[PDB]
């Protein structure tokens, strides 16, 4: 009962953590796409 | 109580899990950019 609601809140915090992890993975993919873009631009300039 | 005790552990570990997962994901993400740069360099 009460322990169920507490575990639900803890799982909500863990789900926020997992959503943050997924958003950070997407952001890392976008950042390394930008890194590939700047590397390609600098390599073309070189 | 059980409710008071149980919720604390997962909530506390959530931030550490998010930070570790973000760092790891960036770790293999930078690998793709480095590989593309290596192919361009070759």
């Amino acid at each position: 009962m009460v322990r169920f609601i507490r575990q639900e809140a803890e799982e909500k915090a863990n789900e926020i953590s997992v959503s943050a992890e997924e958003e950070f993975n997407i952001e890392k993919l976008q950042l390394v796409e930008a890194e590939k873009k700047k590397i390609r631009q600098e390599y073309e300039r070189k | 109580l059980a409710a008071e005790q149980e919720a604390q552990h997962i909530v506390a570990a959530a931030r550490n899990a998010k930070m570790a997962r973000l760092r790891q994901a960036k770790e293999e993400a930078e690998r793709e950019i480095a590989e593309h740069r290596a192919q361009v360099e070759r």
Binding site: M1, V2, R3, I5, R6, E8, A9, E10 | L1, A2, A3, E4, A7
Partner: peptide, 17 residues
């Protein structure tokens, strides 16, 4: 303060709170 122990027992029996 007197009923803290009884409240702890009741929370243990009945059961982010």
């Amino acid at each position: 303060g007197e009923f803290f122990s009884s409240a702890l027992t009741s929370a243990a029996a009945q059961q982010k709170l």
